[PDB]
């Protein structure tokens, strides 16, 4: 199969402290090599690779494109942020917590207690484990944040234990979409 | 620190003559323009009831891309892209429980160029019932991402596999999944 050629223009708006500080980046990628770019923090185009030399020098000559690019931080970035902030920056979806032991065995043997957190947004979240009211700080294996691609995240945090009779484990999750953290327990039951 | 990032990404690929235009917020797609039906498509329905976008701007910007690629190509002396194979992985939406609906997710990560063939297989047979997919999301390293979904009903009698074909792959890659 014949070879392929890719042209990829990427414009990114980076916001800090809301809109207190913004930075625009006009990037251009040929195949896998960025060729030329404009950084609002620099004010003018620069060639990243020798391939972009021709445009970076040219575009800088036309004081009409420079204007478009220098003003983009307002006329483009800040504008759009206002247009979407309501359903993106302000978006909030509650997590769905479930606790269960992988491996259903007889009590008294090493096990793995899974706390699955699913369907939440935004990505910031804190999961903690407690055994009989005391927080466990070791033996926790997490999967990290997983982006499902449909505007929700998921994550799993497991605790390494050796459950005995009368023990009660609680998974507690903190998330902006909840005023008082969520907790779901599991009473050490021999299954 | 850095709070958020909005990205307007687009691309054109030859010989295939396929392009794409979309907006991205912190990794998730806000919308993309359907190159064939010439209409903007919101990732989530609700979004449309909040903003709007004139699909025409996109089709115009793509035309310019087609031209610039033909210039950059020649200027590049005709050096092509080197295929980079994906990193497939299959997951489940929420925790699995017998007889409670769910959805299987097929994560196709870090690959290029933006061409890939994906097939859902249940017990070896292809599946199209309610399957869905996303366009090519971009990634920092100039590579691509993509998701494929398959709603399904949890059971101990079935087995699934996501079949992925990419030019950087020596041959079809199969990701397995099954409840046990």
């Amino acid at each position: 199969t014949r070879p392929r050629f890719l042209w990829q223009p990427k414009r990114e708006c980076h916001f800090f402290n809301g809109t207190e500080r913004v930075r625009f980046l006009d990037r251009y990628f040929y195949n896998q090599e960025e060729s030329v770019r404009f950084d609002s923090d620099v004010g003018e185009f620069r060639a990243v690779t020798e391939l972009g030399r021709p445009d970076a020098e040219y575009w800088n000559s036309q004081k009409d494109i420079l204007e478009q690019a220098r003003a983009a931080v307002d006329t483009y970035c800040r504008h759009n942020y206002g247009v979407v902030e309501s359903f993106t920056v302000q978006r909030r979806v509650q997590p769905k917590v479930t606790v269960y032991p992988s491996k259903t065995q007889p009590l008294q043997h090493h096990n793995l207690l899974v706390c699955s957190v699913s369907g939440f947004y935004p990505g910031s979240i804190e999961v903690r484990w407690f055994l009989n009211g005391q927080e466990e700080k070791a033996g926790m294996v997490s999967t990290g944040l997983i982006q499902n691609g449909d505007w929700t995240f998921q994550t799993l945090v497991m605790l390494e234990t050796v459950p005995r009779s009368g023990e009660v484990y609680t998974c507690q999750v903190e998330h902006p979409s909840v005023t008082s953290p969520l907790t779901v327990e599991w009473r050490a039951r021999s299954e | 620190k850095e709070e958020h990032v909005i990205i307007q990404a687009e691309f054109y690929l030859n010989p295939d003559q396929s392009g794409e235009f979309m907006f991205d917020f912190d990794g998730d797609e806000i919308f993309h323009v359907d190159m064939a039906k010439k209409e903007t498509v919101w990732r989530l329905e609700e979004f449309g009831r909040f903003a709007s976008f004139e699909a025409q701007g996109a089709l115009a910007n793509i035309a310019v891309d087609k031209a610039n690629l033909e210039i950059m190509t020649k200027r590049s002396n005709y050096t092509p892209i080197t295929n980079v194979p994906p990193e497939v992985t299959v997951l489940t939406n929420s925790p699995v429980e017998l007889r409670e609906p769910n959805v299987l997710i097929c994560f196709i990560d870090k690959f290029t160029p933006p061409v890939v063939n994906v097939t859902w297989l249940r017990n070896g047979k292809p599946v199209t019932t309610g399957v869905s997919e996303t366009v090519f999301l971009p990634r920092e390293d100039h590579l691509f991402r993509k998701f494929h979904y398959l709603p399904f009903l949890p059971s101990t009698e079935d087995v699934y596999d996501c079949r992925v074909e990419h030019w950087g792959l020596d041959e079809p890659l199969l990701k397995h999944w099954e409840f046990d």
Binding site: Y76 | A51, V64
Partner: peptide, 14 residues
């Protein structure tokens, strides 16, 4: 039209 999303317009090099 609902509030509108501005796109960065493209034009070329010879």
């Amino acid at each position: 039209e609902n509030p509108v999303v501005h796109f960065f317009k493209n034009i070329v090099t010879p």
